[PDB]
Amino acid sequence: YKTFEVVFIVLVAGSLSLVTIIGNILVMVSIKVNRHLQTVNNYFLFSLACADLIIGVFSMNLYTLYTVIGYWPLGPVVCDLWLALDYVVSNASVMNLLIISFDRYFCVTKPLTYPVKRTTKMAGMMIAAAWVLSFILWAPAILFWQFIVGVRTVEDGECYIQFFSNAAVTFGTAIAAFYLPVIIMTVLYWHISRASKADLEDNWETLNDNLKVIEKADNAAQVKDALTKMRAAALDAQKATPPEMKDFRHGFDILVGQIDDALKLANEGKVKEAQAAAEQLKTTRNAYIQKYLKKVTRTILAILLAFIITWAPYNVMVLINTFCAPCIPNTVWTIGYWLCYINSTINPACYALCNATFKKTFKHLLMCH
Ligand SMILES: C[N+]1(C)[C@@H]2C[C@@H](OC(=O)[C@H](CO)c3ccccc3)C[C@H]1[C@@H]1O[C@@H]12
């Protein structure tokens, strides 16, 4: 079965690399070719997509060659450049997640001061500072530690970080570069989720949700559920208010008067007309939303959970490796490493495949024009 496993591993690894490259390239190009996708969040996600792209192109393929061949074939220089590369990139991705978490935390805790300084140049300076800090932290030690000590203990055919020859050093690295950032992002997400936990915002949110659910509906029950719940939220949104009060009160009545005419068509047997009243509900909605004036936290939690779940096994393998070396076979190390790579694979699916503008931009990129 070992001969079969070589082929299966090559196919699975190459497939994962290709999916990573295609996804992150789609994200980056989508952000660059669409101005509507040019915000601070999409700048942070742009840098994250760049790091995941570098992991998909260089790290996955070189590690696949390393494990499949059984030893390092490219030499010591390419080994040091590879280790420094994926280590710097991974560090920059971690501090990028920290940047996103602190950015959202300051958005929810300082609404009257932070958003005015939240511009494009500031986000670019933060990203550049993250990449430079990662390079300074990891590149000189990995590349030049052998010259600092005066001897290269990495024999021919091997490829590993030299100063990681001691287990406690690797464990301290795991604590400083993973566990503490994970705890920081967990506390920050805790305060953000407790901050989102105002009423009329949730009412109108429910309205624009179910109103599009009517259009996306495949069968008949979805239009009735979205209708009824949207109308409970519509009346509860009518009683709440931020003579303009008579017009505010006269948006929901002219809304409901036709709403019951739509639900009347929802129970008659022909749902195509009931769904055809949606655009009219919208052109009536515009007059109210003119005088009227979370998904982001969901995305953040998705990315954070992807990072933690994909990077936890390797780090617990380090913690166990401190006091027991035979407790972790080589295959297990390969599995954990590859999961840490899988983070970059599943990263674009946590924000790109859940945003409508990203969907339309993807469709626009994969079509004729
Ligand atoms: C590419 N990896 C698979 C390598 C091994 C792991 O290293 C870590 O988990 C440590 C913290 O234990 C780490 C090092 C640098 C940056 C972030 C984490 C995951 C990533 C990271 O670039 C290395």
CA of 90 to the centre of ligand 1 (A): 6
Method: X-ray
Nearest to 347 by CA among 9, 64, 50, 120: 50
Residue 236 CA to chain centroid, in angstroms?
Answer: 34
Question: Reported resolution in A?
Answer: 3.0
Whether 86 is in the pocket of ligand 1, judged by its Cβ within 6 Å, is yes
Please, what is the end-to-end C-alpha distance for the chain in angstroms? 47
d(C-alpha 300, C-alpha 306), whole Å: 10
Nearest protein CA to atom 13 of ligand 1, as residue = 177
Radius of gyration of the chain (CA): 26
Q: Does the structural domain 199-292 have CATH classification 3.40.50.150?
A: no
Q: Is the minimum distance from the CB of 173 to ligand 1 under 6 angstroms?
A: yes
User: Please, which residues have CB within 8 angstroms of residue 283's CB and are 6 or more apart in sequence?
Assistant: none
- 178 CB near ligand 1 (under 6 Å): yes
What's the rounded Cα separation, in Å, for the pair 170 and 154? Answer: 16
User: Each residue of 219-258: b (16+ CB within 10 Å) or e?
Assistant: eeebbbebbeebbebbeebbeeeeeeeeebeebbeebeee
DSSP per position, 84-150: HHHHHHHHHHHHHHHHHHHHHHHHHH-TTTHHHH--HHHHHHHHHHHHHHHHHHHHHHHHHHHHHHT
Number of H helices, E strands in the chain: 16, 0
**Nearest CA-CA partner of 300 in 54, 69, 41, 57:** 41
Q: How far is CA 25 from CA 31, 207, 224, 261, 354, in A?
A: 10, 35, 40, 47, 17
Any idea which fold 2-194+295-365 has?
Answer: Rhopdopsin 7-helix transmembrane proteins (1.20.1070)
Ligand 1 centre from 32 Cα, in Å? 29
> Nearest 5°: phi and psi at 110?
-130, 75
Single-letter amino acid code for the residue at 338:
W
94 CB under 6 A from ligand 1?
yes
Whether 307 is in the pocket of ligand 1, judged by its Cβ within 6 Å, is no
Q: How far apart are CA 244 and CA 246, in angstroms?
A: 5
- The amino acid sitting at 12 is V
d(CA 327, CA 285): 63
| Residue ranges matching CATH 1.20.120.10 in the chain | 199-292
Residues of the chain with CATH 1.20.1070.10: 2-194+295-365
